[PDB]
Amino acid sequence: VKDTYTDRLDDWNGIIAGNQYYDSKNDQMAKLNQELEGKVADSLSSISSQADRIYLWEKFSNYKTSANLTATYRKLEEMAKQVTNPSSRYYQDETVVRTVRDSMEWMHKHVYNSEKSIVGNWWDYEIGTPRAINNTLSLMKEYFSDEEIKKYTDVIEKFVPDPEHFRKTTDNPFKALGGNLVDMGRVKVIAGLLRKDDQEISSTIRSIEQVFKLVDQGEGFYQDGSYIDHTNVAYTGAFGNVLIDGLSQLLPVIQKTKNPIDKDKMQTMYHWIDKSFAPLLVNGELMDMSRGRSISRANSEGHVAAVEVLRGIHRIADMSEGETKQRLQSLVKTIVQSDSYYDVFKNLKTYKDISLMQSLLSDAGVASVPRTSYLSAFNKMDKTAMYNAEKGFGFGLSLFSSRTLNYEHMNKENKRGWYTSDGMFYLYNGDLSHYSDGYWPTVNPYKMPGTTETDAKRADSDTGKVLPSAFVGTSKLDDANATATMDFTNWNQTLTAHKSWFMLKDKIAFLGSNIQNTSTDTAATTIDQRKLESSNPYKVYVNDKEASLTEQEKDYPETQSVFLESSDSKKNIGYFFFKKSSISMSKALQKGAWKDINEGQSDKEVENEFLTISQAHKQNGDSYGYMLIPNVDRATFNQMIKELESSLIENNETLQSVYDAKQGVWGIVKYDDSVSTISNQFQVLKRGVYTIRKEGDEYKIAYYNPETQESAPDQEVFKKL
């Protein structure tokens, strides 16, 4: 017979497989089931047989590569899903049942058991493999005896005995937090259920509860929405995904155990969704600046990664109720519906998830209204996300400081993300596929957009660094206006620049001063490197005069503006140079392979066309200043830049400021404590970042000191003249 433990595992199966929700007449479900049918068949026809072999599958033979461990167990899990799916051609198949039971025994005797030691990555020994095993056993529990289950999970207890720590069999174990902490639950809570071990369950759950705390230091979610992981990396979009994705699968089960989690304790979850996740999603795309090294993975481009968060959010809404359930549903609905590029079902991998998404999209009772404008200053992870609902464009500012790592290159992934945080900017417009379709393996890693750098060669073997300066941060006035700055110094301290950004509702001014180079390499700022669509060509205008770009760089001296004109106004990009400047442009096909940036990816060649614009800085004390104006047609652009003829208030080594006359808003960055009189109306007195709005004879002030990470009383930083 059985019990409440199996009852929980039954619940878990419906969440992880959802065989009980399958419907052959359901288009989406049938498609996933067909995908699983093909996998099992491939696995079944390639599995080695006769006289105990040296590998189950030739592709994952080398048992010294921990990867081959969980990839092998995942193949049995797939078999477990189909074998328990009444609509599968493998339903209760004697061969498939024996193959799983045999493969478990073989692997246990020769590759993964209690007498072994972590060989390769610990993750596979404590997370990857134990999960695949728990799932396989949970699904086929009616084919395995309890003795066999215990026997097969003992090794999991060996490698992961402590619900609070990972790598417990090593010399350098670590306290499980965030995503890892959630993975700890999918490992020990399930194993606990399978082993009918209450202690394991309660302790692991008690341990999981730690995930609900907001932090003000270290890894985790901060009150400002930032999410830090791997000590000091902005990671909402990769580890955050795993956290929400995994937690949402677990909660329903945990909540039905002897130790359910208090409602109040789970409160923060909605804080993550609203403050941390939502702002990073633009037209179904999860901003790459928050995905760490995941960006180097071919099967995880922006829209795909976003579904990871969305399915988690949807699962949460589903266990919620009333308003909370309602608004979360609308949130998922509208995001999914705004995505005209990626089919959300391509990354919904269980029948329950597919089913939930179908009823949501078809339920007219659930409002799907375009999201309104917002600007999130994630100062605790040095990132800034901006979105204009009226004009429909998104903007992401990627930086780092003494508090954060610039880029993550680990496990051979993201070998060339060197400059992706050196003041790199992201523009999300009509082209929802911009940062997809092989953008990453084809983008020139030496000219990330918005970054100022020398052309020195870089080594793939390099790893991240924190920034010398702490003067990096964003002062947000409201949902449409904010100012940011970065006291920049390049990787080898040969170049510096005071880089500042002024987000003014429907445009962003880029200012750079104090540019210095002590090296022999050339210094230049990449104004942009935009990925083109062969289907939607741009007509390039320089100073409102058609220009023909070539692979070979062309120089445009005395350039006052550049305009990228598409047939779709929502894909237009204009650049107004406050002062006539010398720039270079070129359009060229850029080839590459994912393997180039991620050892474990395919070496198949990829290619994309890119339009590159940059400004060389040949002298010390150089600078740049331009306004980025997207989503307006040519005639409107040409008109807008005439009005903007005097928006630049200043741009030197101590003061940088842009003024929006239409809005009555000022963006200001001060590098010293001198008294700065602005537009003869007011005086700003402290080193820091400001965003001020004049409303009549009144002034709205948004002041931020990025070093101390504090604001300050109005009279300390601002003086009305």
Ligand X SMILES: CC(=O)N[C@@H]1[C@@H](O[C@@H]2O[C@H](C(=O)O)[C@@H](O[C@@H]3O[C@H](CO)[C@@H](O)[C@H](O[C@@H]4O[C@H](C(=O)O)[C@@H](O[C@@H]5O[C@H](CO)[C@@H](O)[C@H](O[C@@H]6O[C@H](C(=O)O)[C@H](O)[C@H](O)[C@H]6O)[C@H]5NC(C)=O)[C@H](O)[C@H]4O)[C@H]3NC(C)=O)[C@H](O)[C@H]2O)[C@H](O)[C@@H](CO)O[C@H]1O
At 297 the three-state DSSP class reads coil
Q: How far apart are CB 135 and ligand X at their closest, in Å? A: 4
Asked if residues 499 and 670 have their Cβ atoms less than 8 Å apart, the reply is no
Report the residue number, 350 or 601, with the smaller CB distance to ligand X.
350
- CB count within 10 Å of CB 55 equals 16
Report the residue number, 179 or 464, with the smaller CB distance to ligand X.
179
DSSP 532: P
Q: How far apart are CB 268 and ligand X at their closest, in Å? A: 20
| Spatial CA neighbour of 180 closest among 166, 169, 192, 170 | 166
User: What are residue 9's phi and psi, to 5 degrees?
Assistant: -70, -25
At 416 the three-state DSSP class reads coil
Q: Which of 411, 518, 582, 602 contacts ligand X by CB under 6 A?
A: 411
Asked if residues 669 and 650 have their Cβ atoms less than 8 Å apart, the reply is no
| Spatial CA neighbour of 320 closest among 282, 361, 267, 277 | 267
Query: Any contact of residue 583 with ligand X (CB under 6 A)?
Result: no
Look at strands 539-542 and 545-547 and give their pairing: antiparallel
Q: Which of 239, 342, 425, 428 contacts ligand X by CB under 6 A?
A: 239
| Spatial CA neighbour of 376 closest among 305, 501, 280 | 280
Report the residue number, 171 or 698, with the smaller CB distance to ligand X.
171
Report the residue number, 75 or 158, with the smaller CB distance to ligand X.
75
Report the residue number, 205 or 427, with the smaller CB distance to ligand X.
205
- CB count within 10 Å of CB 663 equals 15
**H helical segments located in 255-319:** 268-271, 302-319
Pick the stretch among 143-151, 235-243, 365-373, 700-708 that binds ligand X (CB under 6 A): 235-243
Report the residue number, 178 or 441, with the smaller CB distance to ligand X.
178
Report the residue number, 180 or 496, with the smaller CB distance to ligand X.
180
Q: Which of 107, 187, 242, 486 contacts ligand X by CB under 6 A?
A: 242
Report the residue number, 300 or 496, with the smaller CB distance to ligand X.
300
Name the token pair of 565: 């004109």
What b/e sequence results for 287-300 when a residue is b if at least 16 CB atoms lie within 10 Å of its CB, and e otherwise?
A: bbbbbbbbbbbbeb
Report the residue number, 123 or 378, with the smaller CB distance to ligand X.
123
Pick the stretch among 115-123, 194-202, 587-595, 688-696 that binds ligand X (CB under 6 A): 115-123
Q: How far apart are CB 32 and ligand X at their closest, in Å? A: 11
Q: Which of 16, 155, 160, 253 contacts ligand X by CB under 6 A?
A: 16
- Residue 372, Ramachandran bin (φ over 0: left; ψ between -120 and 50: alpha; else beta): beta
Q: How far apart are CB 242 and ligand X at their closest, in Å? A: 5
Report the residue number, 7 or 478, with the smaller CB distance to ligand X.
7
Name the token pair of 453: 């750098």
Alpha-carbon distances, residue 191 vs 72, 150, 247, 712 (angstroms): 19, 9, 16, 51
Report the residue number, 272 or 682, with the smaller CB distance to ligand X.
272
Report the residue number, 353 or 622, with the smaller CB distance to ligand X.
353
Q: How far apart are CB 345 and ligand X at their closest, in Å? A: 14
Closest residue to ligand X, judged by C-beta, is: 16
What's the farthest any 2 CA atoms get from each other in the chain?
90
Q: How far apart are CB 380 and ligand X at their closest, in Å? A: 18
Q: What angle (nearest 5°) sits at the alpha carbon of residue 149, between those of residues 146 and 152?
A: 150
Asked if residues 398 and 426 have their Cβ atoms less than 8 Å apart, the reply is yes
Alpha-carbon distances, residue 339 vs 87, 306, 312, 386 (angstroms): 31, 11, 17, 18
Interaction residues for ligand X, span 366-405 (CB under 6 A)? none
Those residues with Cβ within 8 angstroms of residue 474's Cβ, 6 or more apart along the chain or in another chain: 377, 379, 384, 397, 482, 483, 484, 689, 704
Length of the chain: 721
Interaction residues for ligand X, span 158-197 (CB under 6 A)? 174, 179-180
Name the token pair of 172: 């350098």
Name the token pair of 397: 């500012």
Mask: binding to ligand X, 205-234, rule CB under 6 A, as x and -? -------------------------x----
Those residues with Cβ within 8 angstroms of residue 61's Cβ, 6 or more apart along the chain or in another chain: 54, 55, 68
The H or E element containing residue 46 is helix 27-46
Q: Please tell me the distance from the alpha carbon of residue 602 to that of residue 595, in angstroms, as a whole number.
A: 5
Query: Any contact of residue 598 with ligand X (CB under 6 A)?
Result: no
- 367 bridge partner residues: none
Q: How far apart are CB 253 and ligand X at their closest, in Å? A: 11
Q: How far apart are CB 249 and ligand X at their closest, in Å? A: 6
Q: How far apart are CB 12 and ligand X at their closest, in Å? A: 8
Report the residue number, 132 or 665, with the smaller CB distance to ligand X.
132
Pick the stretch among 116-124, 188-196, 268-276, 469-477 that binds ligand X (CB under 6 A): 116-124
Report the residue number, 249 or 517, with the smaller CB distance to ligand X.
249
Q: How far apart are CB 604 and ligand X at their closest, in Å? A: 20
- CB count within 10 Å of CB 106 equals 13
Q: How far apart are CB 254 and ligand X at their closest, in Å? A: 15
Q: Which of 8, 74, 587, 617 contacts ligand X by CB under 6 A?
A: 74
Mask: binding to ligand X, 117-136, rule CB under 6 A, as x and -? ----xxx----x---x--x-
Report the residue number, 81 or 383, with the smaller CB distance to ligand X.
81
Q: How far apart are CB 30 and ligand X at their closest, in Å? A: 17
Q: Which of 182, 238, 443, 503 contacts ligand X by CB under 6 A?
A: 238
Q: Please tell me the distance from the alpha carbon of residue 137 to that of residue 147, in angstroms, as a whole number.
A: 12
Q: How many residues bind ligand X (CB under 6 A)?
A: 24
Report the residue number, 133 or 684, with the smaller CB distance to ligand X.
133
Q: Please tell me the distance from the alpha carbon of residue 39 to that of residue 352, in angstroms, as a whole number.
A: 20
Mask: binding to ligand X, 329-358, rule CB under 6 A, as x and -? --------------------xx--------
Asked if residues 615 and 581 have their Cβ atoms less than 8 Å apart, the reply is yes
Interaction residues for ligand X, span 530-559 (CB under 6 A)? none
Report the residue number, 233 or 495, with the smaller CB distance to ligand X.
233
Q: How far apart are CB 227 and ligand X at their closest, in Å? A: 12
Pick the stretch among 103-111, 240-248, 376-384, 418-426 that binds ligand X (CB under 6 A): 240-248
Q: How far apart are CB 240 and ligand X at their closest, in Å? A: 9
DSSP 204: H
| Spatial CA neighbour of 552 closest among 581, 589, 580 | 589
Alpha-carbon distances, residue 257 vs 7, 68, 205, 299, 627 (angstroms): 10, 34, 10, 35, 57
Q: Which residues sit at the interface with ligand X, rule CB under 6 A?
A: 16-17, 74, 77, 121-123, 128, 132, 135, 174, 179-180, 230, 238-239, 242, 245-246, 249, 294, 349-350, 411
